[PDB]
Amino acid sequence: QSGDVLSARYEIVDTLGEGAFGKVVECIDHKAGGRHVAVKIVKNVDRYCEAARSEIQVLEHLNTTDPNSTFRCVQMLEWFEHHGHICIVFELLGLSTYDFIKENGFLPFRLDHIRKMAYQICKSVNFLHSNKLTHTDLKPENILFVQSDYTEAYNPKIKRDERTLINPDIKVVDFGSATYDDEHHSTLVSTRHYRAPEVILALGWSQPCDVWSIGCILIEYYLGFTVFPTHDSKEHLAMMERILGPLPKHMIQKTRKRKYFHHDRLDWDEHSSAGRYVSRRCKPLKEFMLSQDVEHERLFDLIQKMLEYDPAKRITLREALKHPFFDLLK
Numbered sequence: 001q002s003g004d005v006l007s008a009r010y011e012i013v014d015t016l017g018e019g020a021f022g023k024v025v026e027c028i029d030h031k032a033g034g035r036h037v038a039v040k041i042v043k044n045v046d047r048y049c050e051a052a053r054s055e056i057q058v059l060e061h062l063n064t065t066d067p068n069s070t071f072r073c074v075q076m077l078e079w080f081e082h083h084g085h086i087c088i089v090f091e092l093l094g095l096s097t098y099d100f101i102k103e104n105g106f107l108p109f110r111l112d113h114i115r116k117m118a119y120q121i122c123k124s125v126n127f128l129h130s131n132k133l134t135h136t137d138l139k140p141e142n143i144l145f146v147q148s149d150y151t152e153a154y155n156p157k158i159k160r161d162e163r164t165l166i167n168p169d170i171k172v173v174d175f176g177s178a179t180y181d182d183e184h185h186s187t188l189v190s191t192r193h194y195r196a197p198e199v200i201l202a203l204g205w206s207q208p209c210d211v212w213s214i215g216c217i218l219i220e221y222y223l224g225f226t227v228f229p230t231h232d233s234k235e236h237l238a239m240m241e242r243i244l245g246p247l248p249k250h251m252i253q254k255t256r257k258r259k260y261f262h263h264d265r266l267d268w269d270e271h272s273s274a275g276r277y278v279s280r281r282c283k284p285l286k287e288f289m290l291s292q293d294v295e296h297e298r299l300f301d302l303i304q305k306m307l308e309y310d311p312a313k314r315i316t317l318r319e320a321l322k323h324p325f326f327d328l329l330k
């Protein structure tokens with residue numbers, strides 16, 4: 001579809017992203033002096049149409065409450081229909097945090113940049129949480145840099161070139177799954193590696209599932225890889241138990257996912273092949289730390305609080321925003 005024109009002004013010139021829903025494309029705006037925008041074009045299929053309409057309602061709400069994007073939600077500029085596809089026009093951002101990492105060879109982000117990003121992500125999502133919303137699908141692909149311009153220097157530690165962002169400011173995009181407190185809550189939310197245990201065990205969820213997702217994101221920014229390299233539910237839980245300890249008993253008694261359990265324990269053989277895989281790749285959380293200095297212990301203190309098993313006990317983003325890890329921004 002490169003070369004197509006939407007609503008008589010937007011010429012598609014590139015693909016920015018892609019998904020279940022359809023695609024996001026970079027367009028030239030022939031009616032505003034040729035400067036560039038992003039456009040999400042949704043598939044002409046019911047479930048994606050409905051999500052898109054819902055996204056539009058959330059964006060109108062958010063953009064009216066915070067017209068200047070103080071809280072770092074993406075700004076919708078307009079929306080329209082075109083060959084029965086819903087099209088949402090956004091301010092053009094830069095690469096996703098996922099793509100920047102990949103482009104850098106999976107080198108993790110420096111801790112100073114991680115502090116700034118984490119702050120902005122928690123500030124953004126806390127704004128949602130303050131307005132009776134849960135995002136439900138937070139992940140690095142959905143956090144984008146405002147500008148992804150970088151400098152480059154040789155790093156003798158690693159013996160190769162590396163890219164450092166000029167400006168690490170982010171925005172949160174994709175409100176297609178975002179859910180108000182009083183609306184229907186889908187059975188299964190989130191992308192698997194960022195999915196909270198209440199979701200996996202179908203106990204119901206709310207704002208705390210986003211906090212778990214953020215915890216998972218921050219680990220990835222720090223390591224450059226997931227700690228949950230899995231595509232199977234029961235295995236993902238064995239990995240949790242290896243990194244965080246046993247699942248709380250009350251969660252186990254409440255769940256109807258009885259296939260995952262034997263007596264009141266995870267039905268998991270450590271000596272099986274999958275057992276060896278987990279034992280190889282996963283280890284107690286604090287063992288992933290790359291240094292012992294206090295900045296690192298505090299990041300890890302936050303992470304651990306975000307990866308509390310019981311959503312009732314998990315840290316809230318209002319509490320996260322005052323965590324000591326954030327003081328070097330003051």
Ligand SMILES: Nc1nccc(-c2c[nH]c3c(Cl)c(Cl)ccc23)n1
Nearest residue numbers: 017018024038090091092093173174
């Ligand atoms: N570059 C840019 N600038 C503004 C918005 C977007 C954008 C909004 N939603 C997106 C989704 Cl759901 C994906 Cl998967 C990829 C990009 C976007 N991207």
